[PDB]
Symmetry: D2
Amino acid sequence: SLEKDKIKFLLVEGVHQKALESLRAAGYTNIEFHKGALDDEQLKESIRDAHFIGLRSRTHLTEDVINAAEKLVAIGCFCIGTNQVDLDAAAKRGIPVFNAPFSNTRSVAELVIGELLLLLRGVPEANAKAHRGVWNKLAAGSFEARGKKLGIIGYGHIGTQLGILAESLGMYVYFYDIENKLPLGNATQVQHLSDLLNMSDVVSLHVPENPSTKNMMGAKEISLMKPGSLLINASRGTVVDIPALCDALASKHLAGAAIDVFPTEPATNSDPFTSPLCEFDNVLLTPHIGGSTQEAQENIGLEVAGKLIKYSDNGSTLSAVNFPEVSLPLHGGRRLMHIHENRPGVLTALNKIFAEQGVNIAAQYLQTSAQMGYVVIDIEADEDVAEKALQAMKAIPGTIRARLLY
Amino acid sequence: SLEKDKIKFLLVEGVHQKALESLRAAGYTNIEFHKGALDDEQLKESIRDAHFIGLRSRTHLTEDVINAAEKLVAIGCFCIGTNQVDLDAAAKRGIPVFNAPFSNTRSVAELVIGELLLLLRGVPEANAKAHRGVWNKLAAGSFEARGKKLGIIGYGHIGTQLGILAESLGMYVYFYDIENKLPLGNATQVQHLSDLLNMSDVVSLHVPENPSTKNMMGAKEISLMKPGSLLINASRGTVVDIPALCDALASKHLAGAAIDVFPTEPATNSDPFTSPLCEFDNVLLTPHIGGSTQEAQENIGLEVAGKLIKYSDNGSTLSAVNFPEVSLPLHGGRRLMHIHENRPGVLTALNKIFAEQGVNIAAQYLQTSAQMGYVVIDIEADEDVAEKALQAMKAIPGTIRARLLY
Amino acid sequence: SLEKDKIKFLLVEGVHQKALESLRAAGYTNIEFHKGALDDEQLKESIRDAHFIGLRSRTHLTEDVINAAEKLVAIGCFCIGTNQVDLDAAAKRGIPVFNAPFSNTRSVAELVIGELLLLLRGVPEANAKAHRGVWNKLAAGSFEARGKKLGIIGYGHIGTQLGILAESLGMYVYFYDIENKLPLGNATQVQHLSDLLNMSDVVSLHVPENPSTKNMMGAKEISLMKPGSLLINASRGTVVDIPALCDALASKHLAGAAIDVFPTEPATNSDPFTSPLCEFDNVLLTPHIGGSTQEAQENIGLEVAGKLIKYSDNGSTLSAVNFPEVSLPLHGGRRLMHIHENRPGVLTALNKIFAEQGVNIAAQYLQTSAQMGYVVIDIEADEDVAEKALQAMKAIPGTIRARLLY
Amino acid sequence: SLEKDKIKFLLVEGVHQKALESLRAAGYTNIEFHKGALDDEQLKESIRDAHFIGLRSRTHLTEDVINAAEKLVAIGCFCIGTNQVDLDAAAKRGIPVFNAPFSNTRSVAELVIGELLLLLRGVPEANAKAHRGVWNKLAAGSFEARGKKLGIIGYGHIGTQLGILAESLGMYVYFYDIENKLPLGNATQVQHLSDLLNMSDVVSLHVPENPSTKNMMGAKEISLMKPGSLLINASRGTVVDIPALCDALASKHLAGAAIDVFPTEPATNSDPFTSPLCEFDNVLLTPHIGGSTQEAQENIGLEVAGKLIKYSDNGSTLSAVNFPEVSLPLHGGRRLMHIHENRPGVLTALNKIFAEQGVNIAAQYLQTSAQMGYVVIDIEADEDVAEKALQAMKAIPGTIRARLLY
Ligand SMILES: NC(=O)c1ccc[n+]([C@@H]2O[C@H](COP(=O)([O-])OP(=O)(O)OC[C@H]3O[C@@H](n4cnc5c(N)ncnc54)[C@H](O)[C@@H]3O)[C@@H](O)[C@H]2O)c1
Ligand SMILES: NC(=O)c1ccc[n+]([C@@H]2O[C@H](COP(=O)([O-])OP(=O)(O)OC[C@H]3O[C@@H](n4cnc5c(N)ncnc54)[C@H](O)[C@@H]3O)[C@@H](O)[C@H]2O)c1
Ligand SMILES: NC(=O)c1ccc[n+]([C@@H]2O[C@H](COP(=O)([O-])OP(=O)(O)OC[C@H]3O[C@@H](n4cnc5c(N)ncnc54)[C@H](O)[C@@H]3O)[C@@H](O)[C@H]2O)c1
Ligand SMILES: NC(=O)c1ccc[n+]([C@@H]2O[C@H](COP(=O)([O-])OP(=O)(O)OC[C@H]3O[C@@H](n4cnc5c(N)ncnc54)[C@H](O)[C@@H]3O)[C@@H](O)[C@H]2O)c1
Ligand SMILES: O=C(O)CCC(=O)C(=O)O
Ligand SMILES: O=C(O)CCC(=O)C(=O)O
Ligand SMILES: O=C(O)CCC(=O)C(=O)O
Ligand SMILES: O=C(O)CCC(=O)C(=O)O
C-alpha cells in the first residue's frame, strides 16, 4: 500500500482507462500515463525508473532502451503484436513480455460480416463510382447474404465467433481447419479445402502466421473458389498471394474482396500505403483495423493490466511470450521467486538454503528455456527467515533476479 | 389452355425467371421475353397484340402507348414504382395496374445492417483513403455494433425486419412510429421522436413519401441526435434535408451516414450524379439499390405474376393501384366481370339480363372508385347462356369492358 | 347510445372477461352474464329478448331453443366446437354462427413440450412410483430433449408453433403434411410418413378429424416408429388406434405416450373415465385440456366478441360457420344489409327501390348458400332516404331480415 | 500399446461406453467392464491387479479393499459422490481420486422447465386423477408459461442455464443470489428475496448445501410467495421445510410443487420412500434424477476417463479430490513423478540425484497437501539414466511412490 506506491507503471500510446482502473483496484497508483508515443529523450527519461511499461505497437523497445531501465520488471504489450519489443533482450534480463492475443475476437467477426454483406451487393464499387459522380443502379449480380454459404478457413477464436454471427443472419457455415474441431450451431467441418473453396460464396481467413499458412491462398486456391465468389482476409498479411488475387479480380473470377492485412504495411499513419489492389473499386482495403474498436481496447486494458498485476503480486508468467511459464496457486505462506541462468547447481543451491536451515517447502514450480530458468517457491516460514533466504538466493551464481513476493 | 395459350404475355426489362415459371405453371405459356427495355417502334410492335405486359422502371407506358395497345388486359410493374405508367389512361381503358410494394424488405434491412457495421468502424473513410495511399489505422471513435442502440423511424415492413436482424447482432432496438405498433422481440416503441433521436447511436429511416415525412430530418432533428451518431436513409429521397446533413457531418456532430435515395436521382446509369455528400468519405452513397438484389427480383417475379394470373383467371383486383378492388372467392359455375363508367343503374341493367334469361346469380361483388365501377358476378349457367349474357353486358351504356373468366 | 342499449348480449358458461370489455369498449353495455350453463327455464327466459348469445360446449341451442329466440341476430361459440348448435336451424332464421378455431395454439404447443420433456426422462412413471412409496432412481433410458428429433404430423397452426418452441430447446424438427408447406426456422418436411416415423424420437400429431386421419396411427405406423420413441396425441380422439398403442407400450417398443383426447370421453367431469391406457404409469393422460388455459380463454373472448361486434356494426360474416361470407371495406356513407331466401327477383327488386328512391350504390357484395342469400350495400344517401329504402326492402318477398347498419 | 496393455482398467456399475472409447483411443485396451456392482470376493478378485478402477456410487472402496489392490494407481468416481471411497486410505497409499463435479447442468434445467410447464397446467393432478378414472377438464387456474415470471434462487451453473431456457419460452426471469452476478439475456437480479418471492409465478432453487441454505424456504418464505404459485426444488434436500410446504399445499397458498431431493432419501431403489408430500397429486415427486440422463452419463464418462488417462500419461492431478494438484506442460524428454511424506529435505534429495548423474532438470512442479507432497520432474536424459534415477528416487526416506511416466 505505501509499498505499491513505489512501484511505477509507465503507460504510453493511450491504452484504455480500464487498465488504470485495474491497477488502482490492485493498489498500484504510481502511474505515468501518456496518450501518445514518446520521443527517445522522453522515453528514456520516463522509463529509467519504471518497474512496468505498457505500450502498443508503435513504441520500439530495442536492446538499448531496455538496458537503460534499471527498475524494469515486466513489459505489457496492450495489443496483439510483439515485434516492437526485443524479446531476447528482455528475457536475458529476467523481464517477461505479455500481450493480448485473443481480446479482439468480436471486433474482427463483426467486420467480416459488414464487409461481406456490402461486397455481395457490389456496394463498394457503387460508392466509389457515386463519389465520382457515376450512377450504377442494378440488381444483376447483387445478393442477399441469407441463404449463402460462408467458408471459414481456420475455425478458432475468431472463426468460431464469425460462424455464430453468420448463422444469426441465416447464412450456412462451413469450416476448414487442420485440426478436428467441434462445430458450434449448425456449422459443418469440411475435410478438404478444395471442397470448401468450391462450395463457398464467401471465403474468410482466420489462421496463424506460419509456414503452413504462408501464401496458402495462391492462384490454385483462388481458382478453386466458386465463380463470382468473395475473399476476405483479416487474419495475416502473408496468407494471400495478392498478385494472384488481383488477377482473379481482373478476370472477374471473383466479384470482390476485403483485405485488412498486407505483406507490407505502413509503420505510422503518416507513411504511404500501396497495393496493386488499390486499382479495384470492388475491393475493400482497410488499414489493419480488424481489431481496432474501443471494445477491444477495453478487453486488452483489462487483460494486460491483469497479467502485470499478477506477475507483480504472485510471480505468474503464464502466457508470457519470451519466458518460462510459471504459475502457482496462492495458498498463503511466503512466496519467493528466482530468475537465473541455468548454471550447474542453482537448484541444488536453492533447496539447500531452506532445507539446511529448518524450512519446509510447501510448493515449487520451476520451468526453463534454453539457458533461462525461473522458479517460484512457497515456504512455511517467519518473515525474517524469508528475508534472509532472499539475500542468500540473490548471491547464487547465475542469479538474474530474485524477489520476495509475499 | 387451348385458350390460355393465346393470351400473349409481353415481359420486358429482364424480370426474374420465377415470373415466367409462375405464368407457365398457371397455363399461360405464350410469353415474349426481353432482357432489356424496347425502343419505341418495337414496344409498339410487341405490345399491339399483348393481353398482358410486365415491365420495370424504364418502360414508359404513356397514354399513346396504352391507347395503341388493342388487346391489353392488365399491366404489371415488376417493381415498386408505377410513375412510368399512365394510370388514368390505363383505368379509362379498364386496365388494372399492379406492382410489388413490399417484396424488397430483407434486402433493404440487410443493407442497413452492413452499412451501420462499417460506418461505426470508420471503414468507408479508411477504404477511400487506402485506395488513395493514405493509411488511417486507429481505434478512437470505432465501435462494435453489439450493445449499441438502433433507433428506427418507421416500424413497418422493413423497420420491423431490420430490428429483428439488429437484435440478432446484440443491438438494442427502439422505434418511433406515428402509429402505435406491437414490438417484436425486445424492440421498444419510443413515444416522442426527440427521445429516440437523443438515445440512438444509429438512426435508420423507413417511412413513406408524403407531407408528414418530407424533410422530417432537418437541422433540428439532426441536432437532437446523439453526438457522433450515424444517419441512414434507404426510405425516400425527400425525407432528409441533405444540406443540413452536410452541415452536421462537416461540424462532426455526426460521425457518418449512408444515403441510398436522393431528392433528384439520375434517370439512367449514363446520367451523371451530383450531391454535396460526395465530398465526405465517411458517407456511403449508393444508387437507389436498397432493394436491388436477385432475391428481391425473385419475390417481385412471383408476386406480380401472381397478381396478373389471379386477375386473368378470377378477376381479382386487390392491390391494384388504379382500380376498384374486388375479389370473389371461387365456388365454381361461371364467372363474368364488368368494367364501367359510374352511371347509375348499370347494376340494374345487369341484374335484369340474368333475370330475363332465368339465370341464378350466386354471388356478386361491385366496388366503385372515382368516376368508375367494377363488378364480378358468379352465375349458374352453361357456355352458350353465359356468352349470350356477356354479349348483353357489353351493350349496357357506360360499359368499358366485359369478360367471361370461366 | 340509445341504439345499442337495446341490444342484449346473453353470455353463458363463463366466457373470459375480456369479451365483456370488448363489448363495452364497442358501446355494447347490455350484457346478461352467467358463469355456468342455464337450465331450460332460465335459458328460454334469458334468450327470448337476446340479440346475441355467447356460449361454450354445454349449452345446446337446438331448433326449438332457437325458435323461441325472437330477437336473435347471431350466435358466438366461445370455443372451437359448434355441434352444440343446430346450424341449419340458425341458418334458416338468418342467424350466423361464429367460433374460435385457432385461439388455442400456444397452449397445445406448450403442453406437448412439457409432456415430451418429462416423458423422455421417465418422470410420469417415477412420480407414480414415488407417490406409492417406491424409489426408482436411474439414468438408463432417460434423455435430454436437446439434440433429439421431433416428428410433427400436421404442420398447421399448432404444428408450426410447436416446431418453433422445440427448436428453441435445441430439438431437430421434421414434419409430415399432406400438402407442401413452407418450413419455419430449420424445420424439414419429410415427404414420406414412414421416414418421419423411422427417425423421430418424439412423434406428435396435430391433424384434423376426417376419413384421412381416422386411426391413421395404427399398429403398422407404431411399429415403424423408432424403438424407445414416444407418441403424443393432443389433436383428435380418433387419430390413434389406442389398443395398438397399448400393445406397443407393453412390448416396450415405445417408451411412453401422452394422450389428451380419446375416442370416447366423459360428457362431464362427474362421469367416469376409462382407457386401457390407464394401466401404464409411463403414459400421461389428460382430460382434453390441450387448449384449456386462461390465456386461451382470453384469446377466444376477444376473437368471438370481435366477430359479433363486427357483424353488428358493419355486417361482416367472414368466418361464419353456417352462412354466406360477406364483408365490405368501410368507405363511409350509409350501409344496408339484407338477408333472404333466394326467391326470384329479390335482387332486381333491390335496385328498383334505389332507382325510384334515386340512390347511387357505391358497393354491393352478395353471396349465397343453397336457398340462403345475404347482401351488403353501400349507398350515398342522407338518412331519411336510406330509411325509406330500408322499409321498402323489409317488404321484398323472401326477406328474412334487413337493417341499416350505419 | 506393448507396455500399456498391462495397465488394467476395472470399470464397474455401467459407466457410459464413451469412457471406454476414450480409453481405447488413448491406447488403454485392457478393460474389465461390468454393468453392475461386484460382491466382495468377486470385487477383491478383479481389483487385485487393476491399475485403475472406475466406479459409481454403490461400490465401497474401504481401507480394506484399497489396501488389497496391489497394482492400484488411481481411482475414478464416474459420478459426483466420493463417500464410497476412503479418500485417505487412497492418499496414504499415494492414490489420487478423481470425480465429475458438474457434468449435468442441462439435465437439471430441462427437468425444471418440463415440470413448471405441467404444474402451471394442473397436469400432475389431472394425470393422477385420469388413471383413477376421474376426468377433470377445466381451464380455470391453468396457465401458459409464456409471460410468467420465473424466480431463480441461486444463479450459478444451473440457475444461469435455467434462466436461458426460460427466456426462450417467453418467460420473464428474475433471480436472488447472495452475490452480485452478471445477468444473462434479460434476466434481472432482485436484491431482496422477499421481493422475488412476492412477484414470481414459479420459484426454483439452485443453491448449495450449507447453513445459509438449510431450511431457507421455511414457513415465512412460502407465505411470501405469490398466492397460487409453484415451488420447485432440484437443488438439495435440506433447503425446504417440507412440513411447511405441505401446510402451504393443503391451504392452497401454493398451486403445486416439484421436489426431486429430500431431507432423507432411500439408500437404494429397493428401500422404501416416505414423504408427507405423497398425499398431494399436484406435487411431482422424483427420485433425485435431476442430473440422471444419458447425456450426463456420457459427459461423466468423457471427463473422468480423460482424467485417468492424463494422470497415467503425464501425471496430472488437477481436480483430484484427495491429492496435491500438479500439472506440468509437456515439452518432451523424460518425466518422472514422486509421492512422499511432506517433510523438509525430500526435494533436496531428489535434486541431488540429478545433479550427481550430470542430468539437467528442465522443469519441476511440487505441491503439498497437509501430510503429503507430490512432484513431477522433467529431465533431459536417456532411458537407462532415467531408470537408474527412478531406482534412487524410490529409496528416499518417506517415499510413497515413484514412477517414470515417459
Ligand atoms: N486484422 C486484425 O486487426 C486482427 C485482429 C485480431 C486477430 N487477427 C489474427 O487472426 C488470426 C486468427 O485469430 P484467432 O484468435 O482466431 O486464432 P486462433 O488460434 O484462435 O485460431 C486460428 C485457427 O487456425 C487453425 N489453423 C492453423 N493452421 C491452419 C491452416 N494451415 N489451415 C487452416 N486452419 C489452420 C488453427 O487450428 C486455429 O483453430 C491470427 O493470425 C490473429 O493474429 C487479426
Ligand atoms: N431504397 C430502396 O431501394 C427501397 C426499397 C424498398 C422500399 N423502400 C421504401 O422504404 C419505405 C418503407 O417501406 P416499408 O415497406 O417498410 O413501409 P411500410 O409502409 O410498411 O411502413 C412505413 C411506416 O412508417 C410509419 N410512418 C408513416 N409516416 C410516418 C411519420 N412521418 N413518422 C414516423 N413514422 C411514420 C407507418 O406507421 C409505417 O409503420 C418506403 O418509402 C418504401 O417505398 C425503398
Ligand atoms: N387437444 C386440444 O384441446 C385441442 C385444442 C385445439 C386444437 N386441437 C386440434 O388439433 C388439430 C390441429 O389444430 P390446428 O389449429 O393446427 O389445425 P390446422 O388445420 O391449422 O392443421 C392441420 C394440418 O394437418 C394437415 N393435414 C390434414 N390431413 C392430414 C393428414 N391426413 N396427414 C398429415 N397431415 C394432415 C393439414 O394440411 C394442416 O396443415 C385439430 O384437430 C384441432 O381441432 C385440439
Ligand atoms: N437434482 C440433482 O440430481 C442434482 C444434480 C446437479 C446439481 N444439483 C444441485 O444443484 C445445486 C446448484 O448447482 P450449481 O452447479 O448451479 O451450483 P453453483 O454453486 O454453481 O451455484 C450456486 C449459486 O448459489 C448461490 N448461493 C449460495 N448460497 C446462497 C444463498 N443462501 N442464497 C442465495 N444464493 C446462494 C451462489 O452465489 C451461486 O451463484 C447444488 O446444490 C447441486 O448439488 C442437484
Ligand atoms: O494497438 C495497436 O496500435 C495495434 C493494434 C493491435 O492490436 C495489434 O495488431 O498489435
Ligand atoms: O425495379 C426498378 O427498376 C426500379 C427500382 C427497383 O429496382 C425496384 O422497384 O425494386
Ligand atoms: O369449450 C369448452 O367448454 C371446452 C374448450 C374448447 O373446446 C375450446 O377451447 O375450444
Ligand atoms: O451416483 C450415481 O450413480 C449417479 C447419481 C447422480 O448422477 C446424482 O447424484 O446427481
